[PDB]
Design a protein around this ligand. Structure first.
Ligand SMILES: CC[C@H](NC(=O)[C@H](CC(C)C)NP(=O)(O)CNC(=O)OCc1ccccc1)C(=O)O
Ligand SMILES: [Ca+2]
Ligand SMILES: [Ca+2]
Ligand SMILES: [Ca+2]
Ligand SMILES: [Ca+2]
Ligand SMILES: [Zn+2]
Length: 316
């Protein structure tokens, strides 16, 4: 909507206060004009019609319980935009400052979040498996990263290409979480998963097996559930990414860590210059090796570490 840029204040899902960029025209809307062609947050009102209504507020104060998921979807979309722009010189998900749209309060008891081809969508959870999912910065960044993938490599959402798609969202979700630097970790979804259980998470990149996911290609799932295991087999790639960044010895194979920034540069280049809709795990290894070669040189530690990490997870 046409209006003047304003700054509201509110509380997120976890009870933390933050400022949000809004737009004033009669009401204050969750419309951030400071980033690209805008970040827009919508109320789905417990229904499944999308996007719903652009979020309108009378006073620019967002402290109601009902406001909290909207505050976080809006704010964390901003952080994710900033990460891609500042770290990778990418302007929004399409590289041309496309408007970023999110809807919250999707459906009832809805234990998921997704990119629907056009926008991000967040359930509130059922209060047992999840609280409102936009409360996780890694979750928000995971979702926006699906849009980046769809505009770039275009990894088909099934089997190995789909597991790579998933891992790319977990990797950049995590890198955005570290960028914001509030309780960062290599776990996925810990801030909004199982409020009655401390210390767990939906997935782990550092040890995928903790939550039942494979950490070696020999343990891959090849059944039909979950689009051929896209959220399961992602553990193999998540583990490789974790090892590239942090190092470790895994099934006897030692990897020298090169740090998060270099992990991000290598995987961003692979995603945008080498991966294709049908890439499999072996092709991802080749893309990552080539990306590291471009960035750091064929004889570099970085290239050697990429090879060690994929060896460690059984991907040749
Ligand atoms: C709930 C666990 C898992 N979801 C996830 O791991 C994350 C959320 C997480 C980071 C909190 N959601 P996501 O991977 O974006 C869900 N994917 C999904 O709905 O794919 C199907 C789809 C395809 C095309 C258009 C709309 C939807 C799942 O769907 O199995
Ligand atoms: Ca208000
Ligand atoms: Ca965390
Ligand atoms: Ca996390
Ligand atoms: Ca928990
Ligand atoms: Zn996903």
């Amino acid at each position: 909507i046409t209006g003047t840029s304003t700054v509201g204040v509110g509380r997120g899902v976890l009870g933390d206060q933050k400022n949000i960029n809004t737009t004033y025209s009669t009401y204050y809307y969750l419309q951030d004009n400071t980033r690209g062609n805008g970040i827009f947050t919508y109320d789905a009102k417990y229904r499944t019609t999308l996007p719903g209504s652009l979020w309108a507020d009378a006073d620019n104060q967002f402290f109601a319980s009902y406001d909290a998921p909207a505050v976080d979807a809006h704010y964390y979309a901003g952080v994710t935009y900033d990460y891609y722009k500042n770290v990778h010189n990418r302007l929004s998900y399409d590289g041309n400052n496309a408007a970023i749209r999110s809807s919250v309060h999707y459906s009832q008891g809805y234990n998921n979040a997704f990119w629907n081809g056009s926008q991000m969508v967040y359930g509130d959870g059922d209060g047992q498996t999840f609280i409102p999912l936009s409360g996780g910065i890694d979750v928000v960044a995971h979702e926006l990263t699906h849009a980046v993938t769809d505009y770039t490599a275009g990894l088909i959402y099934q089997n190995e290409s789909g597991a790579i798609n998933e891992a790319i969202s977990d990797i950049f979700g995590t890198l955005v979480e570290f960028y914001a630097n509030k309780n960062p970790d290599w776990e996925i979804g810990e801030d909004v998963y199982t409020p009655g259980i401390s210390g767990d998470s939906l997935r782990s990149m550092s040890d995928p097996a903790k939550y039942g996911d494979p950490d070696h290609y020999s343990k891959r799932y090849t059944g039909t559930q979950d689009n051929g295991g896209v959220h399961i087999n992602s553990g193999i790639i998540n583990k490789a990414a974790y090892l590239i960044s942090q190092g470790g010895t895994h099934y006897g194979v030692s990897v020298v860590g090169i740090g998060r920034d270099k992990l991000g540069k290598i995987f961003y280049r692979a995603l945008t210059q080498y991966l294709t809709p049908t890439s499999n795990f072996s092709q991802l290894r080749a893309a990552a090796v080539q990306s590291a070669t471009d960035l750091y040189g064929s004889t570099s530690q970085e290239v050697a570490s990429v090879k060690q990490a994929f060896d460690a997870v059984g991907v040749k």
